[PDB]
């Protein structure tokens, strides 16, 4: 039945949601199931043709009051079901993209649909617009973990050479350890250069 394709799509959406949630570390979203969406869209177009022919028959008046009533209503319901399925899948992908943007971009393009890629770019633009201007003093992209520790000792996980600081410079030398305030090097830690 028409709803079967939507059921498969929403099953894929659930699978990818569980994929992201179960994996603690952020996971690149799966490939857009362009084929499934296209097939569902073709089904929707066929239903549109069927509705138009049904209206034509209503003008022919072949037991329209009941037959056309029911057929039009059921076609509309199936189309709405497909609409909801597609909306749910797309919205889930959108929300995961937003999570990615907030987590890292503020701080796998092939998998993304070109519309999805454009939307993600726009979302990044929006976030940078927010952190810029009023409220700039706080870094919204900053970590949501409370800053319990004023000072943290850190060992450079990956050597990347010297780096600049507001009042200092850190020499990133493989297997070299630094004792510095957490806030200063939190971005480097998020970048994976620094350990602990």
């Amino acid at each position: 039945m028409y709803g079967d394709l939507g059921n498969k799509l929403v099953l894929e959406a659930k699978r990818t949601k569980q994929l992201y949630a179960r994996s603690n570390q952020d996971v690149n979203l799966p490939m857009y199931h362009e084929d499934i969406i296209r097939n569902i869209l073709k089904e929707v177009s066929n239903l549109r043709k069927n509705t138009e022919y049904l209206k034509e028959q209503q003008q022919l008046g072949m037991l329209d009051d009941k037959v056309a009533k029911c057929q039009y209503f059921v076609t509309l319901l199936c189309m709405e079901r497909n609409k909801r399925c597609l909306l749910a899948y797309q919205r889930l992908r959108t929300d995961i993209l937003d999570s990615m943007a907030w987590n890292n971009n503020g701080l796998d393009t092939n998998n993304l649909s070109h519309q999805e890629q454009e939307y993600l770019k726009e979302y990044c633009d929006l976030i940078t617009d927010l952190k810029s201007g009023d409220l700039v003093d706080i870094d919204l992209s900053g970590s949501l973990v409370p800053p319990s520790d004023v000072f943290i000792d850190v060992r450079v996980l990956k050597d990347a050479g010297e780096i600049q600081t507001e009042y200092g410079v850190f020499n990133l030398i493989k297997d070299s350890q630094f004792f510095v305030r957490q806030s200063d090097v939190e971005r480097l830690i998020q970048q994976g250069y620094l350990q602990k």
């Binding site: 937003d98 999570s99 907030w102 919204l140 949501l144 973990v145 409370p146 319990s148 004023v150």
Partner: protein
């Protein structure tokens, strides 16, 4: 999305920690900032500054917990044990608990987290044998958990009354209890025409 899912409908233990540190606490400064009538000043914003610039060695005073911990990380401060954190007090609470199985004891809303913090970074100050204090705290935790299960037995749509349940336990049990209540209410409402 601006908020991770695990933070969507609760506070992680770290947030509980932070809100706890927002509190004040008795301490014995090992420094005398108070400048004699005969210089760097704190001048804080979110908390008092008057006391901080009046520190006098070995003179009890209050400061927000996180400042106290910052100093305690240095040798320049000593954290005074809260009175409720005393073998006598813990024993009294235990006896009350056993006396009133239905009711919870009147421990500080932040007793668990505060005790953990002090144990980790304030072992020296504790007058009583620290091991005994840890054990008694663990026993209180066990008893409270048992009473939590007993109360859960009576989960109902109407309402709940945790009373003296500690904040840490409340945060621990938030998701399960809230979700179960939500589903039960959904069912009962659906029953309603």
């Amino acid at each position: 999305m601006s908020l991770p899912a695990h933070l969507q409908q609760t506070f992680s233990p770290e947030e509980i920690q932070f809100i706890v540190e927002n509190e004040p606490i008795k301490i014995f400064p090992r420094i005398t900032t108070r400048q004699k009538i005969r210089h760097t000043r704190w001048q804080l914003i979110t908390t008092d500054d008057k006391a901080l610039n009046n520190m006098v060695a070995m003179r009890s005073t209050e400061v927000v917990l996180w400042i106290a911990l910052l100093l305690k990380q240095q040798s320049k401060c000593s954290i005074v044990a809260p009175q409720w954190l005393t073998t006598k007090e813990l024993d009294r609470k235990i006896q009350y608990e056993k006396t009133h199985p239905d009711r919870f004891s009147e421990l500080p809303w932040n007793w668990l987290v505060l005790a953990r913090i002090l144990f980790n970074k304030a072992k020296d100050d504790f007058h009583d044998p620290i091991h005994e204090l840890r054990g008694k705290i663990q026993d209180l935790r066990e008893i409270r958990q048992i009473k939590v299960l007993k109360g859960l037995k009576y989960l109902n749509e109407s309402h709940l009354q945790l009373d003296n349940l500690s904040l840490l336990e409340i945060n621990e049990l938030r998701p399960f209890i809230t979700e179960i209540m939500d589903k039960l209410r959904e069912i009962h409402t659906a029953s309603l025409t």
